[PDB]
Symmetry: C3
Subunit: 258 residues, 3 copies
């Protein structure tokens, strides 16, 4: 066990975060979410970290909200989500790339959290279930935002209203993940990809993520203006100067994340 | 025939609505749309109804607008659509799940209407054609909203600008429908699914539909806030209390739609 | 060579535009963009033009921005994009249909430009690479707007963050293009399609493009209102009157683009 249930380890330029309540299928609590927030913040502030990798301990990625967090009192989910929505905000705006390695079941808010990865891998055997509807709830933790963007509205309707269990291979066909790998190889493959990202142009990744997060709500005119502003920022980086020299020399760039 | 051209029948918890102008391929008129509005309203108000099913009589689902509704006068489609857009608003915001059973051709506004189903089935032999461009018109009745969300922008461009006729099997591959079934089994299968939905958590369905309708225009911050508000509502339902007990007991929930 | 690097030729009702810096893979410069703007404007103003076709000379469609346009000075990409974003605005709002024929590599802003076609064809052998990230930049020239709409967010993340090279066949599977044809047949097929569009209801195409450009940022209510306004305009065209007569007579319509 560990206090706060988020294991942390640095491998090169990668901060590896592991959801660690395996006896409860990494069920989500406010305590866990505070620890996840703190770990994301530490990774973003750490100049030795250029990428993050998120996975689960044990057989699950996460089964979603721990229903025992709430008393027998009529629940106040508006207040709970207003308090803990900052964690989704933190994932959404992370200024470093995030790889997610889905090692087992991802259900409810566990599915929400997994889908915040920029690049997502699943083990053979892993699964995704929206789950909320089976207990009379709506999608939360950003799932109503992410799912239609990732899989389109037609599949989002079916997945949310009927809550089927999806295999890793079905997840891959829909865009819930980018790659499926055998369970014994998932962490090796996810870490290799995270290490490659940790050598990449971290600022260009950060700014690209911002453009993607906003794309659907902007007019074309607004999107062009935002592209201009963020490209202005990316153009002033040391990494852009390096990138131009490496292309002229037809060699690999040596990026530093600034 | 029936006055207003919308047949209504209740089977258990399902209101079955049938477009009924088969001699004109269920062509849409203002009269028909007023009758459809009234039937949707009655179904939403009826405490014995937990789901709706929409289909067509005869060989078509609907061939779209009846061009004979308009005189030889220069038409005023802005005024016509401003008057009848309330029917699309009613479909979009329905606080009960809607199944559509596409029994034959769905063209123009008939395609628009079919695509408002939450879950959509087509018969083998049915077809979808955007059609508007073939008479020099633009998509209406919400088709410009729904089509890019359901099939993505690339397919929406082709479907709208070239107006190909799509088979049921092509519709399934694009996400225009969720299932294809033999013509003789379509109503049995669509009714079975509607009856399953009529046993489900109707409030969670209603509130999920609201999140989906708004998802693309919201910022992540706004989407999180709306998730919090609607989850607060879903959390106060009798069905959520039931859903938690049924999960703890690992048995099927017995939902009532409140 | 030609001054401004945009070849122009009219074939029937089609203005054919060819990017013409083949020795530099049709690399984009401000000079080229001014010439492209001017050619789009001339085609839109020309009453003998009902469709446009855009392609590249030589082995590339376009390799994107010419990095030699900028001095050794710290670049100001915000000012550069604010100046040249009008060209993307011009493509986005074109009141005639645009076919793109991707004859070879489309990278960076060359990929951006190709994806503004309403209908897009690629040669066998052509390729698409987002490219910006390889020099530490973000997507520009509307690519952050178009790519998630065309391929969905999951594929847009991978394509932008990892910048794989996509084959024509991969592009087709994602929706980056609508058709793949042998290199020796690309211009014949693209011209045939452009000529068909040049016989179509040009106003309905123009107004449909406007609805598509706005669809994701509008509420359903706003989208319905915009459908009403634009359908009102389309309904007053000579082509709509023709379209109704041709459907009643079950013969091909003879559209004029007004």
């Amino acid at each position: 066990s560990n206090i706060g249930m988020i294991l942390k380890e640095r491998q090169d330029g990668v901060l590896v975060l592991t959801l660690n309540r395996p006896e409860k299928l990494n069920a989500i609590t406010g305590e866990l979410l505070d620890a996840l927030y703190a770990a994301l913040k530490e990774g973003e502030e750490d100049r030795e970290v250029r990428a993050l990798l998120l996975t689960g301990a044990g057989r699950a990625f996460s089964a979603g909200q721990d229903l025992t967090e709430f008393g027998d009192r009529k629940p106040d989910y508006e207040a709970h989500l207003r308090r803990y929505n900052r964690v989704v905000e933190a994932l959404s705006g992370l200024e470093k790339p995030l790889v997610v390695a889905v090692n087992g079941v991802a259900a409810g808010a566990g599915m929400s959290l997994a889908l915040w990865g920029d690049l997502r891998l699943a083990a053979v055997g892993a699964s995704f279930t929206t789950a909320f509807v089976r207990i009379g709830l709506v999608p939360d933790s950003g799932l109503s935002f992410l799912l239609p963007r990732l899989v389109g509205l037609a599949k989002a309707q079916e997945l949310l209203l009927l809550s089927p269990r999806l295999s890793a291979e079905e997840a891959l066909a829909l865009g819930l993940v980018h790659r499926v790998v055998p369970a014994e190889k998932l962490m090796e493959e996810a870490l290799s990809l995270a290490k490659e990202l940790a050598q990449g142009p971290t600022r260009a990744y950060a700014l690209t993520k911002k453009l993607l997060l906003e794309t659907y709500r902007l007019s074309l005119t607004e999107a062009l203006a935002l592209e201009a502003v963020l490209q202005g920022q990316a153009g002033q980086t040391q990494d852009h100067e390096e990138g131009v020299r490496a292309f002229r020399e037809k060699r690999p760039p040596r990026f530093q994340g600034r």
